[PDB]
Amino acid sequence: MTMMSGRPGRVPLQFLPNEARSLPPPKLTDPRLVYMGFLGYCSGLIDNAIRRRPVVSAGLHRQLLYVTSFVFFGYYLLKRQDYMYALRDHDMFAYVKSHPEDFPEKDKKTYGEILEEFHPVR
Amino acid sequence: PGIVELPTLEDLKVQEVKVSSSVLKAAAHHYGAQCDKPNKEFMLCRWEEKDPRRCLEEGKLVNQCALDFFRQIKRHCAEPFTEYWTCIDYSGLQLFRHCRKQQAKFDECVLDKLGWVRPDLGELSKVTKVKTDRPLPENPYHSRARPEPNPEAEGDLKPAKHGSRLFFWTM
Amino acid sequence: LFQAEKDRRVLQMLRENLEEEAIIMKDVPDWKVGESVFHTTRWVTPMMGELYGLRTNEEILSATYGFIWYT
Amino acid sequence: AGRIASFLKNAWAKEPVLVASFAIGGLAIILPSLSPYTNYAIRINRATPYNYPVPLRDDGNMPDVPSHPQDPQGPSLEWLKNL
Amino acid sequence: PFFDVQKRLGLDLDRWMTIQSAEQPHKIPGRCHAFEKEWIECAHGIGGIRAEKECKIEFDDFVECLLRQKTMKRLSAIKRQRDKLIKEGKYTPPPHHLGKEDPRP
Amino acid sequence: MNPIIYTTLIMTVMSGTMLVMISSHWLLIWIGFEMNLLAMIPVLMKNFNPRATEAATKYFLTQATASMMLMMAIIINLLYSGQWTITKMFNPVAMTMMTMALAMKLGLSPFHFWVPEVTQGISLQAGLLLLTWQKLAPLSVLCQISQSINPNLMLTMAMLSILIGGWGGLNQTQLRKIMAYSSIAHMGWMTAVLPYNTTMTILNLLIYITMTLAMFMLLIHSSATTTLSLSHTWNKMPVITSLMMVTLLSMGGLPPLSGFMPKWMIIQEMTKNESIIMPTLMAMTALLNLYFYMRLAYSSSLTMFPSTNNMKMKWQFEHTKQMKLLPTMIVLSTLVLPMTPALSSLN
Amino acid sequence: MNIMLTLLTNVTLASLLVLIAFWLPQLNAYSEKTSPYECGFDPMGSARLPFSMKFFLVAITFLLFDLEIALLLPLPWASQTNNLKTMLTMALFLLILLAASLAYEWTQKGLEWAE
Amino acid sequence: MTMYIAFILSTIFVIGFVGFSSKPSPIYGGLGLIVSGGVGCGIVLNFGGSFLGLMVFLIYLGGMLVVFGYTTAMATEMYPEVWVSNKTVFGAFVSGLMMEFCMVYYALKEEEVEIIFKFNGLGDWVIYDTGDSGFFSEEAMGIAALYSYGTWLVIVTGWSLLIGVVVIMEITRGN
Amino acid sequence: MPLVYMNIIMAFAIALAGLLMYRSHLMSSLLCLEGMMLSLFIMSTLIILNTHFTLANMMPIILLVFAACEAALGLSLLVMVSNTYGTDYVQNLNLLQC
Ligand SMILES: CCCCCCCCCCCCCCCCCC(=O)OC[C@H](COP(=O)([O-])OCC(O)COP(=O)([O-])OC[C@@H](COC(=O)CCCCCCCCCCCCCCCCC)OC(=O)CCCCCCCCCCCCCCCCC)OC(=O)CCCCCCCCCCCCCCCCC
Ligand SMILES: CCCCCCCCCCCCCCCCC[C@@H](O)O[C@H](CO[C@H](O)CCCCCCCCCCCCCCC)COP(=O)(O)OCC[N+](C)(C)C
Ligand SMILES: CCCCCCCCCCCCCCCCC[C@@H](O)O[C@H](CO[C@H](O)CCCCCCCCCCCCCCC)COP(=O)(O)OCC[N+](C)(C)C
Ligand SMILES: CCCCCCCCCCCCCCCCC[C@@H](O)O[C@H](CO[C@H](O)CCCCCCCCCCCCCCC)COP(=O)(O)OCC[N+](C)(C)C
Ligand SMILES: CCCCCCCC/C=C\CCCCCCCC(=O)O[C@H](COC(=O)CCCCCCC/C=C/CCCCCCCC)COP(=O)(O)OCCN
Helix, strand or coil, X not given: CCCCCCCCCCCCCCCCCHHHHHCCCCCCCCHXXXXXXXXXXXXXXXXXXXXXXXXXXXXXXXXXXXXXXXXXXXXXXXXXXXXXXXXXXXXXXXXXXXXXXXXXXXXXXXXXXCCCCCCCCC | CCECCCCCHHHHCCCCCCCCHHHHHHHHHHHHHHCHHHHHHHHHHHHHHXXXXXXXXXXXXXXXXXXXXXXXXXXXXHHHHHHHHHHHHHXXXXXXXXCCHHHHHHHHHHHHHHCCCCCCCCCCCCCCEECCCCCCCCCCCCCCCCCCCCCCCCCCCCCCCXXXXXXXXXX | CHHHHHHHHHHHHHHHHHHHHHHHCCCCCCCCCCEXXXXXXXXXXXXXXXXXXXXXXXXXXXXXXXXXXXX | CCHHHHHHHHHHHHCHHHXXXXXXXXXXXXXXXXXXXXXXXXXXXXXXXXXXXXXXXXXXXXXXXXXXXXXXXXXXXXXXXXX | CCCCHHHHHCCCCCHHHCCCXXXXXXXXXXXXXXXXXXXXXXXXXXXXXXXXXXXXXXXXXXXXXXXXXXXXXXXXXXXXXXXXXXXXXCCCCCHXXXXXXXXXX | CCHHHHHHHHHHHHHHHXXXXXXXXXXXXHHHHHHHHHHHHHHHCCCCCHHHHHXXXXXXXXXXXXXXXXXXXXXXXXXXXXXXXXXCXXXXXXXXXXXXXXXXXXXXXXXXXXXXXXXXXXXXXXXXXXXXXXXXXXXXXXXXXXXXXXXXXXXXXXXXXXXXXXXXXXXXXXXXXXXXXXXXXXXXXXXXXXXXXXXXXXXXXXXXXXXXXXXXXHHHHCCCCEHHHHCCHHHCCHXXXXXXXXXXXXXXXXXXXXXXXXXXXXXXXXXXXXXXXXXXXXHHHHHHHHHHHHHHHHHHHHCCCCCCCCHHHHHCXXXXXXXXXXXXXXXXXXXXXXXXXXXXXXX | CHHHXXXXXXXXXXXHHHHHHHHCCCCCCCHHHHCCCXXXXXXXXCXXXXXXXXXXXXXXXXXXXXXXXXXXXXXXXXXXXXXXXXXXXXXXXHHHHHHXXXXXXXXXXXXXXXX | CCCCXXXXXXXXXXXXXXXXXXXXXXXXXXHXXXXXXXXXXXXXXCXXXXXXXXXXXXXXXHHHHHHHHHHHHHCCCCCCCCCCCCHHHHHHXXXXXXXXXXXXXXXXXXXXXXXXXXXXXXXXXXXXXXXXXXXXXXXXXXXXHHHCCCHHHHHHHHHHHXXXXXXXXXXXXXX | CCHHHHHHHHHHHHHHHXXXXXXXXXXXXXXXXXXXXXXXXXXXXXXXXXXXXXHHHHHHHHHHHHHHHHHHHHHHHHHHHHHHHCCCEHHHCCCCCC
16 A cells, blocks of 8 residues: 555655755754764775775775765755655644544543542552 | 437438449539538537437438439439449449549539539548537536545645654654 | 438437337336436447347348458 | 778678668668658648548637638648649 | 656656557547546546545446446347247237348438 | 676666566556566576576576466456556456466465575576566566555465475575575565555565675675585685674564564554554564574574685685675665664655 | 358368379288388388477577568558658668667577587 | 357367367477467457458467477477377366366356356357448558557567577577 | 357466476477467457457557567577487476475
8 A cells, every 4th residue: 555656746756846845954963864974984894894904994085985975865865754754744634634523622531530440459 | 227218210211312332422522512511510410419319400401402412413414424423333443533534524514504613632621610500519428527636735844743753763 | 421321220220129129028027118228328339239139140140240251 | 981992892792782781771761861752741641531521610710711622721732733 | 666757757658558548540439438538537636546436437337338248138138038929929020120121221 | 698798688677677667558567577587588597507597497487477377467457447557457356367477476475486496596696686686576566556456365475475485494505595585585574564555565675685685795705605615704704704694683683683674664564454463473484584594694603614725725815806885785784773764755 | 251161162172182082092001012211221210209400590580580570561551650750760660670680690600500 | 149150260269279288299289279370360350350360370370380390309209199199188188178168058058157257148249349430440550550659669579579589599509 | 258258268278277287398388378378369359359449459469579589588498408408308407496
C-alpha cells in the first residue's frame, strides 16, 4: 500500500517541491548532519585501513572530501525528510478538520466521578 | 434495466431506391452535387444524435431527393445514362477509367438539358456547413452525474508537530 | 443513402425480433419483454446475434463469413 | 584526401558489390531530405479521403467553410491536376 | 518502482496504446468506444478506491460490451423457449424467419 | 570477451530494468523483462566452463517460463478488461498467475531451487549482479500492483522463503550458496510487508542491497569462495576479516547495527495492522540466518585457522585493483541505524 | 470455402496417385530388395547417428533475420501515412540496424563455417 | 452451430499441441508444431486477420526448419520415438486427448465454469461485428501504424535484435 | 467466453505442462516453449480482432520478435551443452546442487 505515491499536485521526480521552501531549513550544526559527517570520516578511515595506509594521517584531502560529501548529501536528505513529515501532519489535520463526525470531543470526566476497580497487592 | 424503444414497422416504410451499385456509381458525382443539402442534414443529424431512431425523417428526405434526381435523369438523359452505366457495370472493379466516351456523352446530355456541372476533383470531399433548426442535443451519451472529487489541499505548510515522532527520536 | 437504408434495415430486424419474442416469451412468468441488458438508456449497436438470432443458418453463415470467404 | 582515394580504388578493385551497396544506401539516406517533392507526397497522402467528411453546424460565424461542395471556399486540388 | 519519466518530460512513450479510445488511425473506432469513454470520464481524478465503487455501473456496462455474457444468456433463453414451443407445435414461426422474406436495400 | 561488448551487455541489462521501471504499458514491461534476460544470459557465461554453461541454461529455462506466465496473465487481464495500463489488475485468476510468475522471477519459495545453483555456478561478479540488480524489476512491478495482491498467497510464499532460506543456509560450506540462501530469506522479508506498506519494501531492499554489495566486494577482495579458503584471509589481510565479521553481524540483524532497521520497521508496520503471529515467527526464523552468519564469523575472524607456507610469498605483494565504493558500502551496512527517520523521504 | 475445396481436391488427387502406385503393380518384396542403398556395400553405422552442422551459427542468425522480415512487410501500407518523415526515418533505422548486425557477424568470422 | 469450422480448427490446434507436448521426438514435435501453426493461421483467418495468420505461419515454418537441422545435429538417437513406441509418450498423448475431449463435452453439454468462467457455445459467430464501412483493412492500418505511432516499439525491437545477434556470437564463442 | 477461447487456453496449459515435465531431450522443452508463444499469439490476436482495437494489431508482431530472440538464446545454450557432453540430455546438467 502506498500512502503518498499519488497525492494530487505531486511532481514525479522533483525531490523538493516549491512548497518545501516555506519550512525552516535544518541548522548547519544539526546533530544529524554532524552524524553524517562522522559517517564520512569513518568511511575515510576505513578507506585508509583497507589500502594499507597510515589510518589517521594518510590522505587529508581524501578524508576532507569524504566528510564534505556526506554532509552535502545529508543536508538535502534532512530537508526532504522534514518536508515529508510536515506534509503528513498537514494532511492529518486537514482530514480531521473536514470529518468532524469521525473525531468527536466527548465530555471530560474528573477522577472523582470515574469508578476504577482497586486490585489489592497481597 | 428498462425496455428498448423501437419504431413500429409502419414508421420504417418509404419509397425505395432500387437501382444497382453500377447505376449509383455512374450517377454518383451529379447525385452528390445535386442532392447535397438533405444528405448533409441527415449526416449531421446522424453524427450529432448518435442514435438512428432520431434521424428517420431525414432519411426519408434523402430517399425523396434521390428519387427526384433519378426521375429527372430518366426524363431527360435515359439512353446516354443507360450506356454509361452498362459500361461501368461490365467492369469487375467498376472502373471509371475504362468508359470515358459514355461518361462524356452523359455529361454533355445533362449539361445541356438540366445545366448540371460535374464536380471537380477534391470538391465532394470538402467539409461543408449545414444550417438547421434542429436543436443541438445536450447529453447525447446519456451520461449520469459525475462524482465530485476530493476537495483539495489548502493552507500554508508548517513543520510537523514534535518532529517525526518515531519512537525515541526528538527530531 | 446507404447509411439511411442500413438504419432502416437494422431497426426493422430489431422490431421483428421484438414482436416474435413477445409472442414466444409470454409463457414464462417473470420476463419483461424487450428488456435491456445495459444500465444506460442510450443507443447500442446490435451484436449481430441479436439481428440474426431467429433466422436460418444460411443467412447467419452469409452474414458472418460471407465477406471472408468470397475469393 | 589522398589515402582515402586509394582506399576507394582498392575497394572498387576488390569488393565492387560492397562499394555499390554502400553508395546506394548513402544516396537513399541523404537524397529524400534534399528533394522538393517530399512535401508533395505528404500533401497527396493528406488529400486522399478515406472516410466521410462530417459537416459542421452553421453558427453563422464561419465564412471560410463552404455551404456546398462547389462553392469557392475550402481547400483546392488544382495543384494535383498539374502534377 | 514507477518513475513517471513520461509525465515529468511530457514524452508519451507508450500512453498512446494503453486504451481503446485514444486516437486510432483514420479515426477507426473501437467496438466499445462509448462505454470505455464513459467509464474513464466517470472515474477520472477520484482515485482507485473511490472509483471501484462509484463507477461500478459504467464499468459493468463496459464489461458487458466487451464480453457480452448477458446478451447470449438472453438470446439462448429466447431460443430455448422457441424450440420448446415448436416441438409441442404451438409457435408457427413467421415467414420472414424462414427465408421467405421481402428484402430491402 | 571484448570490454566494449561487456559494457554494451551491462547497459542492455540496465536498460531492460529501467524500461520495466518507467513503462505504463504491460507490453513494454514484458519487453523490458525480455531484454534484461537476453543481455543477462551471456554475462553469466563470461568465464566459460561447464558449470557456468549449466547455470546459464537453468537460469534461462526458469526465467523464460516465468515470462511466459507473465504474458499469459497480461493477456487474460486484457480479455476481461481491455486495459493495457499497469493497475489494480481487474481479474483474480490473472492476478494469481502474475504473482506466481513474479515469484518465479524473484526466486521466492516454492520456486527457489534455481538460485543456489545459478549462484554457485557463476563468478562472484556475476553473483553480485544477479543477487543485487536482478531484484529491482519484479519488486517494482509487485509494488505497483500491491493493492490487488492477495495477502494469503504472498504471505505464504514469504514465510516459506524465510524458512527455506534459513534451513538451506544452515547446511552450506560454499560461500556463494550461503549468499543465495541469505538472498532467499531477505526476499521473503521484503515480500512479507508488501501488501501493507511498499515504503518498507523499498527500505529493506536498499539496506539488503548495501549489505550484499559490501559482502560480495569483501569476498572479491580476498579471493575466497569456500569457507576454508576464507579461513586463510586473517594471515594476509586481518582488516578485511574484521570488517567482514562486523558486516556479517549486521546481516544477522543484531542491534545497534543497520541490518536491524528493516526488520524492526517491518515488525512495527505489521503490528499496526493486527498481524501479530507472523512477525514473531519471522524473527524466530531469522535466528537461523544469524546462526550460520555467526559460524562464518567463527571460521574467518574470531579464531585463527592453520595456514600454509606459500602465504609468505603473498605477504610481499599488494592488491592491484581497488574498489572505490567498498568503504562507503561497509559504513552504510554498519553505522546507519541512528538515521532511521530519514526513511520518510522514500515515500 | 473455395480455398478449402481446392486444398481437399489437390490432397485427394495426390493420395489417389499414391494409392494407384501401391495397388496396381505386382509386388515382390524380399529382404535384399528392401535393404538400405549404399552403393552396393552394407553401411557401417546407422543413418540415425548425429550429423554435425558446420553452419550452426548462420542458422541461428537466420531465425533473427527472419523476424525482421515480418517487421518490414507492412511497409507498403506504412507509405500511405501523413507523417512521411517519421515513417521514413523508422524504416531506414530498422534497415540500418539489420545491416549493422550483418556487418558485425561478418567481421567476427560468424559467417565462416566450422571446420 | 454454423459448420463448426472454427471449433474444429481449434480442436485440431489443441490436438497438435498435445502431439508435441507428449515429446515423442524432436522430428515429430516439429511436425506437430507445424500442424498447429497451420490451423492457427486458419483460425485467425476466419476472424479477419489474414496478414497475422500468414505471418505467423511463415515464421514458424522457418523456425521449424532450423529446429529440424538442429535435431539432426544434436538431438538424435538410434531409435527415435513415436507416439506409439513408448508407454510414457503414449500415456501422455492419450491423457491429453481424453482431457481435451472431457473439457469439450463438459463445456458443450453443460454451461459450467471450468477454471476461469463459464461458456455455453453457440459458435463464435454471435459476437461478430456487423460493421459496414471502409476501403481499407483495419488490421492492415493498425499494423502499418507501427512506423508512425510505434517509434518507441521500433527502437526497442531493433535494439533487442541487434543485441541478440551479439549475444549468440558471445554465447557460442566457447574457449 | 466462446469455445475457441477455452481451446486456446487449454493449448497454453498443455504446452506449459509439457515444459514442466522433462523427459530426456532439451529440444523437446524448447519446442514446448515455442508452442506457448504460438498459443499466446493466437489468443492475443483473437482478442484484438474481436474488440476492433486498431493500434493493438501490432503487439503480436512484437511478441513474435521476442519469441524468436528467446528461441535463438535457447538454441545457443543447447549448442554449448551438446558440445560439452555430446548429448542434449537434461540429466547431464547436475554439477550444481541445492
Ligand atoms: C556508539 C558511540 C560512538 C561509537 C561509533 C562506532 C565505533 C567507532 C567508529 C567505528 C569506525 C571508526 C574507525 C574505522 C577504521 C578502523 C579500521 C582499523 O583497522 O583501525 C586500525 C587503526 C590502527 O592502524 P595504524 O594506526 O595505521 O597502525 C597500526 C597497524 O595498522 C596495525 O593494524 P593491523 O591490521 O596489522 O592489525 C590487525 C587487526 C586490525 O583489525 C582492526 O583494526 C579492526 C577494526 C575494524 C573496524 C570496525 C568495523 C567498521 C565499524 C563498525 C563498528 C560497529 C560499532 C557498533 C557496536 C558493535 C561492535 C563491533 O586485526 C586483528 O587484530 C583481529 C582482532 C579480532 C577482533 C574482532 C573485533 C573487530 C570489530 C570491532 C569494531 C569496534 C568499533 C571500532 C574499533 C576501533 C577500530 C580502530 O586504528 C586507528 O589508529 C584509528 C582509530 C582512531 C581514529 C579516531 C581518532 C580521532 C582523532 C582524535 C581526536 C578526537 C576528536 C574529539 C573532538 C574534541 C576535540 C578534542
Ligand atoms: C544502507 C543505507 C541506505 C543508503 C541507500 C543509498 C544512499 C545514497 C544514494 C543517493 C540517492 C540519490 C537520489 C536523489 C537524486 C534526485 C532523484 C529524486 O528525484 O528521486 C526522488 C525520490 O527520492 C529518493 O527516493 C530519495 C533517496 C534517499 C534514500 C535514503 C533513505 C534511506 C533510509 C534511512 C537510512 C539512512 C540513510 C543515510 C545515507 C548516508 C523522486 O521521487 P518519486 O519519483 O516521486 O518516487 C518514486 C518511488 N515511488 C513513487 C514509488 C515512491
Ligand atoms: C488419377 C486418380 C483418380 C483415378 C480414379 C480411379 C481410382 C482407382 C482407386 C485406386 C486403386 C487402383 C488399383 C487397381 C488394382 C486393384 C487393386 C485391389 O483393389 O484389388 C485387389 C482387392 O481384392 C482383395 O484382394 C480381396 C477381394 C475383394 C475383398 C472383399 C471385400 C468386400 C467387397 C464385396 C465384394 C462382392 C462383389 C462386389 C460388387 C458389389 C487387391 O489384390 P492384391 O493382389 O492384394 O494387390 C495387387 C493387385 N494386382 C494383383 C493387380 C497386382
Ligand atoms: C536524457 C538522455 C538522452 C540520451 C539517451 C536516450 C535513450 C533512449 C534512446 C532514444 C530516445 C527516445 C526518444 C524518442 C521517442 C520517440 C517518440 C517521439 O520522439 O516522437 C516521435 C518523433 O519521431 C522522431 O523521428 C524522433 C525519433 C528518431 C529516432 C532516431 C534514432 C535514435 C535511437 C538510438 C538509440 C536506441 C538504441 C540504439 C539503436 C541504434 C513521434 O512524433 P510524431 O510522429 O510527430 O507524433 C506522433 C503522434 N501522432 C501519431 C498522432 C502523429
Ligand atoms: C552510408 C549508408 C550505409 C547503409 C547502406 C548499406 C546497406 C548495407 C550494406 C552493408 C552490409 C554489411 C557490410 C559488410 C562488411 C564486410 C566486412 C569485410 O570483412 O569485408 C571484407 C572485404 O574487405 C573489405 O572491407 C572491402 C573494402 C572495404 C569495405 C567496402 C567499401 C566500403 C565503402 C566504400 C565506398 C563508400 C561509399 C561509396 C563512394 C564512392 C566513391 C565515388 C569481406 O571479404 P571476406 O569475406 O572476408 O573475404 C575472405 C576471402 N579471402
